Design a protein around this ligand. Structure first.
Ligand code: SF4
Ligand code: SF4
Ligand code: FES
Lengths: 56, 230
C-alpha cells in the first residue's frame, strides 16, 4: 500500500499480474511473536504398567 | 570324570563340578550382567542382577553362585530373562542421586553401561530418594555414602584380605549404611585399592578427585616402581 493510483495503474498496465494484491511487503500477516507458551506432549509411550523395553 | 554337559542356548560345553553358571558362560564367550560378583573376590548372591532362565525351570536363579549339575541348558536371550533384568534395573536406579556429571567414574561406571545395554528407559517413582550423610574414611579416599548401591564388595574384600575389619553395615531395610560405625579413619595398606573395586563412584580417590575424566586419557603400559614385584 501507500502508493498513488496512477503508478498502480501503470503496474497493472505493464503486465496483467495485479501487483496491488500480493506485493512482497509482509505487513501484519506474520503471527504476533511471543504467544503464550504451548506444551509439547509425548506420544505412544510414557504411560505406565505395560511399556517394557523387552518388547519394542 | 568331572566333565559336565551344559548347553549354552543348545551348544555343548564341558564344565567342572563346583564351577558356576558364569564360568561356563565365560568359557563359551558369554557374560552375564553382575554387580556383587567379582572374578578375584568372594562369592555371594547379593546383587540379584545375574538372574537367568533355564529351559524347563519355573524358578529363576542367580547365576553367580549355582553349583552346576549334569546336563543343563541356559537361556541368555529369552523372554523373562530380559524382563527380570529390566525389572531389577528399574529397582537399582531409584535410590541413586542425579550425580553422573559430578561423579568421578562417569566414563567408567557400571550402572551406566548396564542401564544402556540391559535397562528400561521411562522410569517411575515420582517422589522420594532419601540421602545418606558421608564421613571421611581417611585423607586419601574421598567418600560419598549416597551413591552406594550396597553391593557389598568392599566389605568382603576387607573381611577376607585386608584384615582391618572396621567396615560393616548398620541399620536395616532401606536404612542401611555402609562403612564405619565408630567414625574411625581407615589408614592401612592397600587403602587405595578400593577405588578399583567399588563398582559405582562411591569410594573414589581423594587426590585424583577432579583433575580428569576417563574418556580423554590415552593409556600406556608401565611397571610398578618402589617395590620388587612389578
Ligand atoms: S556411579 Fe552413580 S553417579 Fe556415578 S556415573 Fe554411575 S550411576 Fe552416575
Ligand atoms: S561402597 Fe562401593 S563396593 Fe562398598 S558396598 Fe557400596 S557400592 Fe559396593
Ligand atoms: S552376581 Fe549373582 S547376585 Fe550379584
Amino acid at each position: 500500500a501507500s502508493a498513488t493510483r496512477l503508478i498502480q495503474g501503470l503496474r497493472n498496465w505493464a503486465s496483467g499480474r495485479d501487483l496491488q494484491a500480493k506485493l512482497q511487503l509482509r505487513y501484519q500477516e506474520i503471527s504476533k511473536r511471543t504467544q503464550p507458551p504451548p506444551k509439547l506432549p509425548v506420544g505412544p509411550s510414557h504411560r505406565l504398567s505395560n511399556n517394557y523395553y523387552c518388547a519394542r | 570324570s568331572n566333565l559336565i554337559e551344559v548347553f549354552v542356548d543348545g551348544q555343548s560345553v564341558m564344565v567342572e563340578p563346583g564351577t558356576t553358571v558364569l564360568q561356563a558362560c565365560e568359557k563359551v564367550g558369554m557374560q552375564i550382567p553382575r554387580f556383587c560378583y567379582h572374578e578375584r573376590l568372594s562369592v555371594a548372591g547379593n546383587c540379584r542382577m545375574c538372574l537367568v532362565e533355564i529351559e524347563k525351570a519355573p524358578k529363576v536363579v542367580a547365576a553367580c553362585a549355582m553349583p552346576v549339575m549334569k546336563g543343563w541348558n541356559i537361556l541368555t536371550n529369552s523372554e523373562k530373562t530380559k524382563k527380570a533384568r529390566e525389572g531389577v534395573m528399574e529397582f537399582l536406579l531409584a535410590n541413586h542421586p542425579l550425580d553422573c556429571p559430578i561423579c568421578d567414574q562417569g566414563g567408567e561406571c557400571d550402572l551406566q553401561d548396564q542401564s544402556m545395554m540391559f535397562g528400561s528407559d521411562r522410569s517411575r517413582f515420582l517422589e522420594g530418594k532419601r540421602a545418606v550423610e558421608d564421613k571421611n574414611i581417611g585423607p586419601l579416599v574421598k567418600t560419598i555414602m549416597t551413591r552406594c548401591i550396597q553391593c557389598t564388595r568392599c566389605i568382603r574384600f576387607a573381611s577376607e584380605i585386608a584384615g582391618v575389619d572396621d567396615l560393616g553395615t548398620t541399620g536395616r531395610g532401606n536404612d542401611m549404611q555402609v562403612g564405619t560405625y565408630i567414625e574411625k579413619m581407615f589408614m592401612s595398606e592397600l587403602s587405595g585399592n578400593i577405588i578399583d573395586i567399588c563398582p559405582v563412584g562411591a569410594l573414589t580417590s581423594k587426590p585424583y578427585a577432579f583433575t580428569a575424566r576417563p574418556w580423554e586419557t590415552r593409556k600406556t603400559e608401565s611397571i610398578d616402581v618402589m617395590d620388587a614385584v612389578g
